[PDB]
Structure 1
Amino acid sequence: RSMVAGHASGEEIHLAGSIQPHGALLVVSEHDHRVIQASANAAEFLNLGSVLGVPLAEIDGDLLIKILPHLDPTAEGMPVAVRCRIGNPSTEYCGLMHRPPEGGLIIELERAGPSIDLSGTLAPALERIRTAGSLRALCDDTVLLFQQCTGYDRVMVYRFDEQGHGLVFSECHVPGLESYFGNRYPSSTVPQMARQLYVRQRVRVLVDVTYQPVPLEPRLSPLTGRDLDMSGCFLRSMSPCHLQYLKDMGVRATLAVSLVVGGKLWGLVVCHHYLPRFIRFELRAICKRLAERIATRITALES
């Protein structure tokens, strides 16, 4: 840090090596079911005395009993989310599990909330999507639906053209904010490797733009000797160049949902808040569902 000067002292976004602090991340080796990497906050987040090197079986609570049914790997059910209790004092979490191509089993834990009961909201949302008669109507209904379901201060459909340039194609926002409707932005604002990642990982939640990243410990995977592939991690810390851009805009929190059409990133539903904001698993899942439905309608509309 300060003690190293002289000449030698002078981005792959999926290899962040760190998470956002609203969750905890465990990496488990499946030969022994022991934690081989964890976010540095994990023991305090989960109210455990220790975490790194611990067998899942010995972790206070029921995480192991809750994940066992999903571990047999042929069952091609992952990624999957489980609800469990961990820690002393005990807390309910939702645990999102997936396997990176190498490096073990990742378990990302957020504090659990209640059941969200939006099925009566969702029936008519689905009818508006399925009957929209043009892309203009579809995307205008999309921003309204998402704003209603998520409550973010601004919701946009950010559409990509053939050269990758961004267009704010639809927008809705709370009274008195600035409108970005119809603004165009260069393709460089969403780099190609981000777009590929957003084809894999269809929802991103940035809770607080100002957060301090929480590093994984150890940083390198003990299984691979490389950084952990965090492409599938919903807690992944986001590129600092992006976080600066958001700070420059005065945005505090974001939710983005991919629109994938014919296997390409067609656009994004992009939501901004002016205070920190988190949407829990059950709501993210509904967002994902809506985005699949929208992409189906876009495919039909385009011919």
Structure 2
Amino acid sequence: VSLNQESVLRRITARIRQSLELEDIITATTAEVRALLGTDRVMIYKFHPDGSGQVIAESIHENRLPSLLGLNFPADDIPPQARELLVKSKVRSIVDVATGMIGQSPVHISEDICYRPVDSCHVEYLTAMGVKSSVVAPIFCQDELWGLLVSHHSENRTVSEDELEAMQMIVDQLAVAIAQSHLEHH
């Protein structure tokens, strides 16, 4: 009756089984992730080869944040240090604007969230978008960084380990969808 991570994954798995078009899998899954997390805006961001990227799916609750679907953002928005954490540690990151802190959890039992001061450039970036809470988990295809699952909220909120676990399961299942689609299409 209520949405859980298990039922969201079961539907992604069925979509893969039916060989639905990958872009449609990504679009439909993004909407369920937003419903599951309850946040104002959930996006899937896909990297280009030069490290810039594009918002390729987006689900927004009640027009509470602007639509970024289709927009491109430069490589420099994610500096080398942050990018390295994504690639090598598969870090999940929670930004809390009100406290000026970022909480990071590698995948590598190292799944206790450790909070530290976040760079003011990134705080200012989020504030300009009207975002008070950001949660990001990277998406891989095989061993390569493919994109990001991004959750934005217009108000302060707390983020639990269970929520990061749900996001991690979802990006792991999307990785399977992406790899299977590549295999099916040559």
TM-score, normalised via structure 2 length = 0.80
Task: Write the letter of the residue equivalent to 1:133.
Answer: L
Who is 2:49 aligned against? 162
Structure 1 distance, partners of 2:43, 2:84, is 20
Structure 2 distance, partners of 1:294, 1:117, is 16
Contact 1:129 1:293 in 2 (8 A): no
Query: Which of 282, 291, 296 lines up with 2:162 in the alignment?
Result: 282
Who is 1:236 aligned against? 115
Structure 2 distance, partners of 1:133, 1:119, is 20
Structure 1 distance, partners of 2:8, 2:143, is 28
Which secondary structure does the structure 2 equivalent of 1:236 belong to? Answer: strand
Contact 1:125 1:145 in 2 (8 A): no
Query: Which of 189, 192, 196 lines up with 2:80 in the alignment?
Result: 192
Structure 2 distance, partners of 1:185, 1:195, is 14
Task: Write the letter of the residue equivalent to 1:244.
Answer: E
Structure 2 distance, partners of 1:287, 1:295, is 12
Task: Write the letter of the residue equivalent to 1:156.
Answer: M
Query: Which of 82, 90, 99 lines up with 1:201 in the alignment?
Result: 90
Structure 2 distance, partners of 1:249, 1:281, is 25
- Unmatched 5+ stretches in structure 2: 107-111
Structure 1 distance, partners of 2:141, 2:44, is 14
- Unmatched 5+ stretches in structure 1: 1-115, 215-229
Who is 1:291 aligned against? 171
Identity %: 27
How far residue 179 of structure 1 moved from its aligned partner, in angstroms, is: 0.7
Contact 1:128 1:141 in 2 (8 A): no
Structure 2 distance, partners of 1:117, 1:175, is 22
How far residue 193 of structure 1 moved from its aligned partner, in angstroms, is: 2.5
Query: Which of 123, 141, 153 lines up with 2:28 in the alignment?
Result: 141
Cα distance change of structure 1 residues 285 and 132 upon mapping to structure 2, 3 Å threshold: farther
Which secondary structure does the structure 1 equivalent of 2:136 belong to? Answer: strand
Structure 1 distance, partners of 2:91, 2:18, is 24
Q: How many residues align?
A: 172
Cα distance change of structure 1 residues 287 and 212 upon mapping to structure 2, 3 Å threshold: closer
Question: What pairs up with 1:173-188 in 2 under 5 angstroms?
Answer: 173-176=60-63, 177-188=65-76
Per-residue CA shift, 1:221-272, capped at 9, x if unaligned?
A: xxxxxxxxx8746333333221111012211101111101131211001111
Which secondary structure does the structure 1 equivalent of 2:62 belong to? Answer: coil
TM-score, normalised via structure 1 length = 0.51
Looking at secondary structure, tell me which structure has more helix per residue. Answer: 2
Contact 1:157 1:170 in 2 (8 A): yes
